[PDB]
Swiss-Prot record, chain E:
Keyword Signal listed: no
Protein species of origin: Sus scrofa
EC number(s) recorded for this UniProt protein: 7.1.1.2
Protein name: NADH-ubiquinone oxidoreductase chain 1
PROSITE patterns in alphabetical order: COMPLEX1_ND1_1, COMPLEX1_ND1_2
Quaternary data: Core subunit of respiratory chain NADH dehydrogenase (Complex I) which is composed of 45 different subunits.
Subcellular locations according to the entry: Mitochondrion inner membrane
Function field: Core subunit of the mitochondrial membrane respiratory chain NADH dehydrogenase (Complex I) which catalyzes electron transfer from NADH through the respiratory chain, using ubiquinone as an electron acceptor. Essential for the catalytic activity and assembly of complex I.
Catalytic activity entry: a ubiquinone + NADH + 5 H(+)(in) = a ubiquinol + NAD(+) + 4 H(+)(out)
Phylogenetic lineage: Eukaryota, Metazoa, Chordata, Craniata, Vertebrata
Class of enzymatic activity (EC top level): translocase
Amino acid sequence: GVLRLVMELSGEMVRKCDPHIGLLHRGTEKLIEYKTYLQALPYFDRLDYVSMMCNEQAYSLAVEKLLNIQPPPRAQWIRVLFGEITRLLNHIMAVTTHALDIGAMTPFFWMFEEREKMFEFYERVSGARMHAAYIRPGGVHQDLPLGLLDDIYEFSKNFSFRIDELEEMLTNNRIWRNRTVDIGVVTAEDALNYGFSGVMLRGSGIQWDL
Amino acid sequence: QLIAVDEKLDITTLTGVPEEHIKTRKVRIFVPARNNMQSGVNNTKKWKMEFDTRERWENPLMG
Amino acid sequence: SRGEYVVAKLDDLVNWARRSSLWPMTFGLACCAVEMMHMAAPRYDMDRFGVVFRASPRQSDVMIVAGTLTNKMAPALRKVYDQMPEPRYVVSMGSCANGGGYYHYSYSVVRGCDRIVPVDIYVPGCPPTAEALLYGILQLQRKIKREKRLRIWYRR
Amino acid sequence: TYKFVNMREPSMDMKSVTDRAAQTLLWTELVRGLGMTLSYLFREPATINYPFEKGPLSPRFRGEHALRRYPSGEERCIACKLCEAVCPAQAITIEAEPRADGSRRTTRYDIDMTKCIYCGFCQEACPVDAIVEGPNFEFSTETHEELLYNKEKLLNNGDKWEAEIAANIQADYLYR
Amino acid sequence: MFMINILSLIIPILLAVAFLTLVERKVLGYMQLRKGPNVVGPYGLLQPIADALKLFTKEPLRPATSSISMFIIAPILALSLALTMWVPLPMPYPLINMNLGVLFMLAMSSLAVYSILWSGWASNSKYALIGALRAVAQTISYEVTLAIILLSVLLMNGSYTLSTLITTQEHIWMIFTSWPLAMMWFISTLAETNRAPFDLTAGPFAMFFMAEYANIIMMNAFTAILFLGASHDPHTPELYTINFVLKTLALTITFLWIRASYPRFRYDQLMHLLWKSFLPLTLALCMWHISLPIMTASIPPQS
Amino acid sequence: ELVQVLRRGLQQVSGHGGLRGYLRVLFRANDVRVGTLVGEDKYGNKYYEDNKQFFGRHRWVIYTTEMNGRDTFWDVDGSMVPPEWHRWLHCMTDDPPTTKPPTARKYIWTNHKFNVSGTPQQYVPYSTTRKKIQEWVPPSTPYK
Amino acid sequence: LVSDGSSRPYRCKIKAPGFAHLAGLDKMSKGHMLADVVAIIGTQDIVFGEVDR
Ligand SMILES: CCCCCCCCCCCCCCCCC[C@@H](O)O[C@H](CO[C@H](O)CCCCCCCCCCCCCCC)COP(=O)(O)OCC[N+](C)(C)C
Ligand SMILES: CCCCCCCC/C=C\CCCCCCCC(=O)O[C@H](COC(=O)CCCCCCC/C=C/CCCCCCCC)COP(=O)(O)OCCN
Ligand code: SF4
Ligand code: SF4
Ligand code: SF4
């Protein structure tokens, strides 16, 4: 997004780095207190706006736990399926934008086509392309359309090729490796103490997955 | 390790409230009256602090 | 006479040249930037209209404010706006940039980017689909086509 | 279960060393990337010809708001103020009073489209299908003032888009 | 009618540079599963005209504090050098026939960095000065390798005359005699013009862009003449002109391809790449090509 | 082969009513494809389809040259499509309004209107409610 | 999430991984070139909507 970075540099090397945040702080947590739970649900779509249904799922899980209820099995299956689709969206986002910042910029388009297809899936299930607000504490809001599963299967049976095409460009490239190898190394103890989670842990060898 | 100072607490200069929103306002502490449209008493358990009513006007556009 | 005809044709030519190549700088503040780049995706292809992808602020023609404008951010947007060369056009995308949107009653949110910079086109949506933002860009092009600068100079 | 992504040991035979050296000296992987890009050049682009071609949508799409009415012509809105109470962005303002015939009707129904988040809670909280989120999305505006709809604008939108709204509702009402 | 020839050389180069932006956009788009401009004009053919008119109609932002002298001198020098490079080249007959054409073009390439240095100094900003210093250092470092490789290749020609390259490659292209020098020459031309993967950096800006793209086209033409020699029939130079133009177009499209296909190098990596991989191999191949004509008794005639 | 694609190009030229129509469609829509005519609009729009194209490009519309009051030879926008063809064209249904027209209502607009922003027909917001507090009116007769 | 028994949440604190990762950015960029900070930020997968909230 938008980031302010103040650094002290001695020559080319970076001696000190200090990021200033708050340019995107809208005070959401205080706004939530004035809304009911259903009214506070759409904020989590905006929180991490690359992985929306995942935040929806987290909020829904928290609320039901306090309530002492549980969704029906089909709701859980739809939740997990769309969470995996959202993970595909977010990983495409991260890899392609990282390559664009490095300077590749072609896989950005190649994979944003698939991102548009997944946005069509989102819109078909909920009517909104990204800010879906589909997952609720009780369960999924409206149920799947009749032809959705077949289209998901059709999309998902050619995506490996897309990843494979992307792989050819960056996995074996020497410029990409020289740009990424031995950069930003963090030890397992430092990653655990500094509060890291997700890939930032698993890249250092820590076997942890929620 | 302990000051043991004796003075009434005053955090007025730390809250950031404007000067004219401190000595001009008049807060009210009360137990809200039961809504006569209902017979339930669950809303009259706690104490409420609220500020005085100020001016509200009509927007020239959209009213 | 021929005096008005010549300025008419020249004004048409310059308006066509200006609206046929719009170079935008995009303020990707929030989630509306995702739809912004989805408009540059192969499906919609902003570039085929002459609208380049991520032009520099110094040679940019139109500013696209895509996301929430906070109080900590507004002076930066104004400062970037001033640097831009004229003729400069501003496009407000999304409810957050339009009027505060979901965070309208917030201490740290500017209640609309029109408090800071003048805005030519307002794109509604949370977020506006890439097709909607494409329609907004084309509407801005038509608005540029509608302007008549050489006539006003002739009649003044 | 877990996998190792970078736990390979390069072969240290003479042939493998020579193959890696040939890759370094002759840029074989760079040539492979060039070939992949060339292959991607010679396939059909996915660009559509807007505005002569439109992107696919669904009956569930949320766009411009509209106020509907019964086949007789009477407005469906009964001033229940459920949409206003459920609106997360506080974008709906409602004022109501008895009509000249005693019916329960609104005198003011305002939606600030620069505050709306297009979540659709308003149309799903309405018990009479009065307010709907229509299918129109190409309603960009040159000024902030025209994005503040009142009752007349929403009723005009409903009368303008009734055909498509009725078709979409007929398609999708069995999922609700 | 010398002035007629001068204009008929200068103007078409400018027109080709004008249409190269459209061709580059179209090719990058069709590489990225999309299209280039097809609205402004029947097929985007009017797009460069729209860009030129818009740039010549936009307001100029004079810094109001900079030294106007170098500010106006730099684009003049850049465009003049970019246009001056073309005269030495034979297509198949040069406009100006010179004995040391290659040395003349090397000298112009050497002078080219003055525009960068003056634009950096006259901008009245520290960051722009830093960027200018980086660009100048990269340019001179790579021009060293350009010069050495050019001498090594010309050792098989017998003289510095650009026309003799037509006679040397009468039966076989120079690409087959020394391809490693050709690959390093291509990479050095990529790094000279600040083209990806080395692109680390209204009116005057348009002139600078014109000079840059004209230099790119000229470099591609020089490479085509140097390594891919076409057969010239004195009774029909049209065929040689056709072949040379086609090869120049192929090399320019290859530049656009490489821009669309690869990431960008880090500044230290581009510097280390050159100074630790190109220079040693370039020196070794220069020694090899010095020894070769004596070893095989195949010394070129002219002296 | 190449002769086949040249033949298809010539068929594309011929199916547009000759060279004049070919140039007209090329300069108006930036496309010279020929497809089956699906329907004609009340305002003059023509709707074509071609199921052999990939999804998204299999349905398209040639806009009319004169809508309600303005010349739309060059100025065309997506807001010029009526609602029924809006549903057909956006792939919200597989049935054109020709085979199954929408239900008829007396209040439904008989004349579609495009986006009128930046035009004397633009929408101006205003309050729709009466005055709340009525002021006292002094008498017209003197007191002394 | 802290609930007081009403229909509105008493408190809702949001823990985003981007917060901790951007906090560790300072450590992870020690002794690296200026151009590597972009790579580090990209590999951290930072979206500022969740960082700032
Ligand atoms: C050699 C001397 C050069 C001197 C400087 C002159 C620069 C070069 C001269 C060439 C000028 C090019 C003009 C051609 C522009 C016509 C573009 C035409 O195709 O557009 C249409 C025509 O638009 C306008 O009606 C045309 C106005 C253009 C000006 C008319 C002729 C002016 C020439 C006068 C030159 C005299 C110069 C004197 C001062 C030096 C409308 O299309 P548009 O709306 O865009 O896009 C809609 C896209 N759709 C169709 C897919 C929906
Ligand atoms: C008995 C007779 C012998 C005669 C000689 C024969 C022996 C010659 C054998 C070797 C010669 C070939 C070597 C030529 C130059 C190679 C230099 C090199 O290897 O550089 C690479 C790097 O090279 C590059 O990456 C440059 C490419 C950068 C991107 C540009 C795209 C290039 C690919 C497009 C194809 C180019 C086509 C050129 C043809 C030109 C036609 C005119 C080293 O990089 P690293 O792997 O990181 O190792 C150093 C760190 N430890
Ligand atoms: S305008 Fe809407 S979609 Fe865009 S960031 Fe704000 S809430 Fe999200
Ligand atoms: S869509 Fe949501 S935010 Fe918009 S008016 Fe309806 S309830 Fe309110
Ligand atoms: S639109 Fe529907 S929910 Fe809103 S006040 Fe009218 S009847 Fe009630």
